[PDB]
């Protein structure tokens, strides 16, 4: 099928947020993990950067343990910048 | 001066009505004695409760103390507003406005939804039962969508206890599918106790889980259980037994002989019991208010029919109604005061977490303040896995001579001996079983390797 | 009322019940033996000496949205028919992957609502759900419409769900033309002989 | 400055869409013109494909003339495909 | 377009028309020049096809 | 000297710390160290000199 970076997007997000999830407590630990796993499920233009990788950075920098719900709701609007390299 | 109170008492009640009795002996005055007469019923049973009501009412009682369930609160509530009649409780506080009703219990949503929101949870599993009502449930849904929060709710009341083995076993199994660690438990102490044998039965008792009883009663049943499991505990205490006069209280209640007041030989009372007492308390110092006020209620003749029609109240009603209302006084549930609805007001509710010494006092709540926080609070052998690769690790010529980290060697193994050296722990060299280093694999998306 | 029939001796007794009242109803007459019949929301347990003339609208609903394939929706209730309804859903959101919004709107007065409804679908709005479940008596049912059309949300890419027998028996002629989807239960088939021949009888 | 390919998306759809209504009747002519503008406007994280080529193709297979709105309301949410190549 | 010519009695599916072949041109933005009667009605219309 | 800011320096670092950047989200001012030491610890007064 065909892809779309921006429906890769929404995806994306959801993934990562879906994931961490079940790792709630230690949440900021497994944010690479988790975007690693949204990465393999809602694919990805370069295998290097990932769905959305200034989500990633976003969340990486501000998660904190179980401050999951809001940190997602700030980071998911960001941009992702180029998934090219 | 004889006051003429009804009461009612659901059949097993014991310790309740023991610290009823305590309450007219400790309270009882000079000036004026209660003359209670108790009735015992089905108190989920409508037409019971209906039966009871209107005999007391017949009697002519001047008020009435009992109890009520989910199904037969409407009746007390409905009844109790049409005939004027005043009705106390230590049962479940009503949602909305009824009036005629006073109602001794607290209402623990906001130190609940004050619990989570310092334990920082967002997201948990609710467990309830249709017992004191869903009005929690509504509670926090609503906090839930206004906070944000991913909510699991499960009526764990409408599964029958003759089949229920595998039930529980499938509710922690799809809980543990999620990997959702926190718990609420808002259930009747009964319901509690099955639930967490159920819980150390399958083992979900262990480190990782947190449990949050919703409930006045959280020292009154057996922590002992669970204590040693592992998983951290939180709940709610209404009566704070550091009190002197709830010590003293205690001191006359322990050397009570169990004989002439059933259960009454205990170190701890449960809340309901004691939330009886505070009402003997509250409905002596009503009519002494009333007294003091030079206001007599006496009543001039029988009241006759309680479901003649048209229904009419009596006058003194709405007096005595207003005389209970305007109670402040001091008891085991600390300071007791109501609004003019009749809940209460200005309540403390202790909130307590369970350690391994056993359960402690870690902050109060309050209606304004919420949450106030009370006082602040060997080497493992490393296990190393490696791989083996030239010359990084590789088996000595002699190694079927030898045990442990001395078959080993090469440039890591000596690598390794160095780390364990500067920091100083005790290391055992093992090859990985897949003999990989690691991967993601593309199907089962597991991490293969070391 | 009850006991007035009661010592009147009547064989059968058909009414409603509320929410609040139906324990009394269904303790007295299992209790007098009074037979009970009613068109009001079905009691959850077994309950003898009671007839009741609803269907269950659980089952319905839940194949409905697992039709429609809702992974995440929001849920509007009012206390009225009891909760029974929504600790299904909310059981069965358990059981699945669904992601569902409980929200109370009969706790509202009628007077001072206004900007209830606009806060409301302004939360609504924060998780940009489209995708919203009504459970409530037809009354509620209205107005919620009502509120709905004013903020224009009645427009395409909305989806609604009202669960109750009366899908028809409210006006849906205000969000008909709005170009948003709307979904619901009938249990009167107008096309059946039976009920078009009652009708024919029934408008004169 | 981060791009974020989905609003790129959003922005190309919109600058072609409002391009292609000031050519009227000639709307299926100037679909490269406006996609060539939109290009511009809105930034590519690759010159040659343009911001979104999915719906630029969307458009240039539907388009008819007068068609437009309805054509441009079909083409908007289509995939755009691999922005990179 | 002329919205005076078109009696009260039948007009329902007249203005749905109207502004289908409205959204034929993707016109948005629009200017009522008319009586409160016939503004009211429009506007209600409007609100009805959610435009 | 006709410029400011981060277009007044050149370099591999310089080029590393706009990727850097780039990469972090974040909008960076490059600046110069006070005391042109990278870095050290004062065997006596136990301070830290330097980046
Ligand atoms: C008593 O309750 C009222 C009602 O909320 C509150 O305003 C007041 O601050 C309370 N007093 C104390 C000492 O908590």
Same mark, same amino acid.
């Given at each position: 099928?065909? /892809?779309d970076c921006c429906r890769m997007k929404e995806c994306c997000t959801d993934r990562v947020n879906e994931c961490l999830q079940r790792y709630s407590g230690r949440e900021d630990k497994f944010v690479s993990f988790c975007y690693q796993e949204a990465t393999v499920?809602?694919?990805s233009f370069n295998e290097i950067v990932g769905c959305c990788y200034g989500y990633q950075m976003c969340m990486i920098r501000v998660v904190k343990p179980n401050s999951l719900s809001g940190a997602h709701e700030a980071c998911k609007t960001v941009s992702c ?5 | ?8 008492? +659901? ?7 023991? /610290? ?34 209107? =005999? ?18 409407? *009746?007390?509530?409905?009844?109790? !507003? ?31 939804? &004050?619990?989570?929101? @310092? ?23 609503? &906090? ?22 595998? *039930? ?23 319901? $509690? ?9 399958? !083992? ?28 951290? $505990?939180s709940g709610f205490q209404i009566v704070d037994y550091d009190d002197s006069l709830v010590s003293k209280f205690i001191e006359r209640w322990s050397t009570l002989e169990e004989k002439e007041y059933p259960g009454a030989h205990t170190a701890t009372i449960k @809340?309901?019991?004691?939330?009886? @007492?505070? /009402? ?17 209620? =006496? ?10 029609? +048209? ?17 402040? $006084?001091?008891?085991? &549930?600390?300071?007791?005061?109501? #609004?003019?609805? !009749? ?25 304004? #303040?919420?949450?106030? $926080? ?16 030239? +010359? @990084? ?23 390794? /001996? ?33």
């Amino acid at each position: 099928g065909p /892809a779309d970076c921006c429906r890769m997007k929404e995806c994306c997000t959801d993934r990562v947020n879906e994931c961490l999830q079940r790792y709630s407590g230690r949440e900021d630990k497994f944010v690479s993990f988790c975007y690693q796993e949204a990465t393999v499920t809602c694919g990805s233009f370069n295998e290097i950067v990932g769905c959305c990788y200034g989500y990633q950075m976003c969340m990486i920098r501000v998660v904190k343990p179980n401050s999951l719900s809001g940190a997602h709701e700030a980071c998911k609007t960001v941009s992702c910048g180029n998934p090219c390299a | 001066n004889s006051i003429q109170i009804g009461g009612l008492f +659901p059949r097993g009640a014991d310790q309740e009505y023991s /610290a009823f009795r305590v309450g007219m002996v400790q309270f009882s005055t000079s000036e004026f004695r209660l003359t209670p007469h108790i009735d015992n019923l089905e108190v989920a049973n409508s037409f019971a409760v209906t039966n009871a009501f209107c =005999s007391q009412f017949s009697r002519g009682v001047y008020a009435i103390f009992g109890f009520y369930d989910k199904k037969s609160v409407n *009746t007390i509530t409905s009844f109790c !507003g049409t005939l004027h009649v005043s009705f106390i409780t230590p049962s479940f506080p009503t949602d909305g406005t009824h009036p005629f009703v006073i109602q001794m219990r607290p209402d623990l949503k906001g130190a609940l939804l &004050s619990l989570i929101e @310092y334990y920082q949870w967002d997201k948990f599993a609710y467990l309830y039962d249709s017992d004191r009502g869903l009005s929690t449930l509504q509670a926090v849904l609503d &906090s839930a969508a206004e906070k944000k929060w991913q909510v699991t709710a499960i009526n764990v009341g409408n599964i029958n206890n003759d089949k229920k083995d595998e *039930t529980y076993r499938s509710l922690f199994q799809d809980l543990e599918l999620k990997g959702e660690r926190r718990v609420i438990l808002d259930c009747e102490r009964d319901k $509690v106790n099955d639930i967490v044998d159920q819980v150390i039965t399958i !083992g979900k008792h262990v480190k990782g889980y947190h449990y949050i009883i919703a409930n006045l009663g959280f020292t009154d049943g057996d922590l002992l259980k669970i204590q040693f499991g592992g998983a951290e $505990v939180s709940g709610f205490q209404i009566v704070d037994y550091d009190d002197s006069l709830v010590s003293k209280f205690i001191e006359r209640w322990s050397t009570l002989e169990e004989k002439e007041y059933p259960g009454a030989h205990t170190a701890t009372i449960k @809340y309901t019991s004691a939330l009886t @007492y505070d /009402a003997v308390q509250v409905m002596t110092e009503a009519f002494r208010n009333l007294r003091k006020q030079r206001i007599e209620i =006496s009543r001039r003749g029988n009241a006759g029919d309680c479901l003649a029609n +048209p229904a009419v109240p009596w006058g003194q009603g709405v007096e005595i109604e207003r005389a209970l209302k305007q109670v402040q $006084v001091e008891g085991l &549930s600390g300071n007791i005061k109501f #609004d003019q609805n !009749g809940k209460r007001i200005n309540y403390t509710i202790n909130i307590m977490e369970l350690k391994t010494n056993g359960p402690r006092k870690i902050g109060y709540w309050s209606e304004v #303040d919420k949450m106030v $926080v009370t006082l602040t609070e060997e080497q493992k052998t490393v296990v190393v896995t490696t791989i083996l690769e030239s +010359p @990084y690790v590789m088996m000595k010529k002699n190694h079927e001579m030898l045990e442990g980290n001395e078959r080993y060697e090469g440039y890591c193994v000596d690598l390794a /001996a160095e780390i364990a050296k500067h920091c100083g722990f005790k290391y055992k060299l093992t090859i990985v079983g897949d003999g990989k280093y690691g991967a993601r694999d593309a199907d089962t998306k597991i991490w293969n390797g070391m």
